Amino acid sequence: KPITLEKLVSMVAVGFAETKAETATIKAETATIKKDIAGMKHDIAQLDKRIDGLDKKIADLVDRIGRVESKLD
Amino acid sequence: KPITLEKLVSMVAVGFAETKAETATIKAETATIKKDIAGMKHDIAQLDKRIDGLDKKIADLVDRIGRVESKLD
Amino acid sequence: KPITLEKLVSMVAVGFAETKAETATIKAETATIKKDIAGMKHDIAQLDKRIDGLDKKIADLVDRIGRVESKLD
């Protein structure tokens, strides 16, 4: 194995391209994860909203039951 | 520092292995993040479900209060 | 292009530093993604809590309507 200069030249080239190509894969996956998270934060914020809506309806029903429990008497 | 060919050979080897090993760490973390997100999307979908259940119960109570408010009169 | 030993020495150095610097960027982004997820798991757990609170209020209103529907008769 008299491993030469032009050979290591090529080994360096291809090694770097590999490591770079693998990096890029991780970058892409990372970008798609970011996007999933933006979507999930939105779904959580929408659920928060729905629940705000039920808090209000619940306030209303507690008031309507009050009116009736008292009027009944 | 008469930095030689067989020396850079070794430096190239170990450098690449490093960068590769570090890459693999990022890949693994990325995989565990993916899995956390799959779980979180499921928890959000289950919360959506629970809330669907409360929407229905709320429809029911609004109807039962109606029956009584009117019958009372 | 009589590409020499000291030249590839430099190319190796700078290539590695690059790939290392790019790696570090991915690591940082990965760390901030982890942190977003810790926050999102907390928001989901808090929503779970809010809903536990509405389950209880709903139990209460179903009981109060019961008392009245029956007393009315």
Distance CA C51, CA C56 (A): 9
C15 and chain A: CB distance < 8 Å anywhere?
yes
Number of B to C CB contacts under 8 A, please give it.
66
DSSP code at position C58 = H
Distance CA B12, CA B6 (A): 10
Answer yes or no: are the C-beta atoms of A15 and B16 closer than 8 Å: yes
DSSP code at position A72 = T
Return the SS3 of A2.
coil
Is A71 close to B68, i.e. CB distance below 8 A? no
Distance CA C6, CA A25 (A): 32
DSSP code at position C72 = T
Nearest CA in chain B to A14: B16
Return the SS3 of C44.
helix
Which of C23, C30, C51 is opposite residue B19, by nearest beta carbon?
C23
C36 and chain A: CB distance < 8 Å anywhere?
yes
Answer yes or no: are the C-beta atoms of B12 and A8 closer than 8 Å: yes
The approach used to solve this structure was: X-ray
Return the SS3 of A31.
helix
Nearest CA in chain B to C68: B68
State phi, psi for C72 to the nearest 5 degrees: -35, -35
Return the SS3 of A32.
helix
Query: How many other C-beta atoms are found inside a 10 Å radius of the C-beta of residue A17?
Result: 10
A59 and chain B: CB distance < 8 Å anywhere?
no
What are the E-state strand segments in chain A? none
Q: Which chains touch A (3 or more CB pairs under 8 A)?
A: B, C
Q: Enter the tokens of residue B52.
A: 């669907």
Distance CA A48, CA A64 (A): 25
Three-state SS sequence of chain B: CCCCHHHHHHHHHHHHHHHHHHHHHHHHHHHHHHHHHHHHHHHHHHHHHHHHHHHHHHHHHHHHHHHHHHHCC
Distance CA B7, CA B11 (A): 6
B5 and chain C: CB distance < 8 Å anywhere?
yes
Closest CA to A69 of B69, C18, C12, C24: B69
* Shortest Cα distance, chain B CAs vs residue C27, angstroms: 7
- What sign does the CA torsion over C20, C22, C23, C25 have? positive
Distance CA B36, CA C39 (A): 12
Tell me the structure's resolution in angstroms, rounded to a single decimal: 2.0
Mutation choice for B interface testing from C10, C29, C47 by most B CBs within 10 A? C47
